[PDB]
Design a protein around this ligand. Structure first.
Ligand SMILES: Nc1ncnc2c1ncn2[C@@H]1O[C@H](COP(=O)(O)OP(=O)(O)OP(=O)(O)O)[C@@H](O)[C@H]1O
Ligand SMILES: NCc1ccc(OC(F)(F)F)c(Cl)c1
Length: 325
């Protein structure tokens, strides 16, 4: 059977906090008043929610309302949002109401004047990538230190008001409490951001999953290639990774955890050498790449989840020396 694994940091944060902290099922929601809010416009729709720009008419402030589709695990997202509230760069849950139409809970958040992703990605300077990556790390070290893994780190879940240089990590719907030895569902994160642990069906994963997703974001930005690992499906996703990191280190990884690859891989994986990060550098991205960016990326994009930098280690990296703190 597979070899067990544990996080190398914040391993026992949940056993030492009171049960009411992590036992989200026993949490009692204290409902706000839907009366307080007036919907202005529909911002988006996902498979789990509809998001609206709204006005809180009791204090005349712009808010964002996320009306959850009935699909249960709502208590988990509420509990995590309340636990993390006030944390650095963590979106603030302002209220919880019952939508009289859907009959489901609606989460009310603070509003972030989010600059369009493809508009921002195209204008980021080297300094701005370092600056915003440091702001994301503050959010991840905080939630990790609080015994929570995000499990959906990706550019669409990072709200940025570029004008005010304000960042918020949002969409805590897939976030979970980390309990050592617990097996988790591998059907988390967006395809391009899924860690090798998920792709090889290794269930005893931890906060380090977030650090692989962060590395995918960093690679896409510094190299100007969105997404960096462009798999057609979950199987080709691992082949795309193996074409860069190599098959020898992939085999060492699955061997360490006594994991067997799905036989489907026999006809598609092949043999690949590890590629030097310098190969992805070209005249259109050279101004975003440095030896420090490459060294930092190399320490995030590792097969072995136990070998990745943690968020706190990542904030110590020379890549961030230039960032004003
Ligand atoms: N606080 C916020 N301020 C501004 N926009 C927000 C805020 N929170 C969420 N959004 C917007 O809501 C949309 C998606 O929200 P969210 O990620 O929380 O839910 P979701 O169910 O995962 O939806 P999706 O599958 O579309 O990503 C995005 O368009 C994002 O810009
Ligand atoms: N979703 C907006 C958005 C815009 C730029 C981004 O990259 C950056 F963090 F480096 F700035 C991200 Cl992660 C997200």
């Amino acid at each position: 059977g597979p070899v067990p694994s544990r996080a190398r940091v914040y391993t026992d944060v949940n056993t030492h906090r009171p049960s009411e902290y992590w036992d989200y099922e026993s949490h009692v929601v204290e409902w706000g008043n839907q009366d307080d809010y007036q919907l202005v416009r529909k911002l988006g729709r996902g498979k789990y929610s509809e998001v609206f720009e709204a006005i809180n008419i009791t204090n005349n402030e712009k808010v964002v309302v996320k009306i959850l589709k009935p699909v249960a695990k709502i208590k988990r997202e509420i509990k995590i949002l309340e636990n993390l509230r006030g944390g650095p760069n963590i979106i603030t849950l302002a209220d919880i109401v019952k939508d009289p139409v859907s009959r489901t809970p609606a989460l009310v958040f603070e509003h972030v004047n989010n600059t369009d992703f493809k508009q921002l990605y195209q204008t980021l300077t080297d300094y701005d990538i370092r600056f915003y990556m440091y702001e994301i790390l503050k959010a991840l070290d905080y939630c990790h230190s609080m015994g929570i893994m995000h499990r959906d780190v990706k550019p669409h879940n990072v709200m940025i008001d570029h004008e005010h240089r304000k960042l918020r990590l949002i969409d805590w719907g897939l976030a979970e409490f980390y309990h050592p030895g617990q097996e988790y569902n591998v059907r988390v994160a967006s395809r391009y951001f899924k860690g090798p642990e998920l792709l090889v069906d290794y269930q005893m994963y931890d906060y380090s999953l977030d650090m692989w997703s962060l590395g995918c974001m960093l690679a896409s930005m510094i190299f100007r290639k969105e997404p960096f690992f462009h798999g057609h499906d979950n199987y080709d996703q691992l082949v795309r990774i193996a074409k860069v990191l190599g098959t020898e280190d992939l085999y060492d990884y699955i061997d360490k955890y006594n994991i067997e690859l799905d036989p489907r891989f026999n006809d598609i994986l092949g043999r690949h050498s590890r590629k030097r990060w310098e190969r992805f550098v070209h005249s259109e991205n050279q101004h975003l790449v440095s030896p420090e960016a490459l060294d930092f990326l190399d320490k995030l994009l590792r097969y072995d989840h136990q070998s990745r930098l943690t968020a706190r280690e990542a904030m110590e990296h020379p890549y961030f020396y230039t960032v004003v703190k």
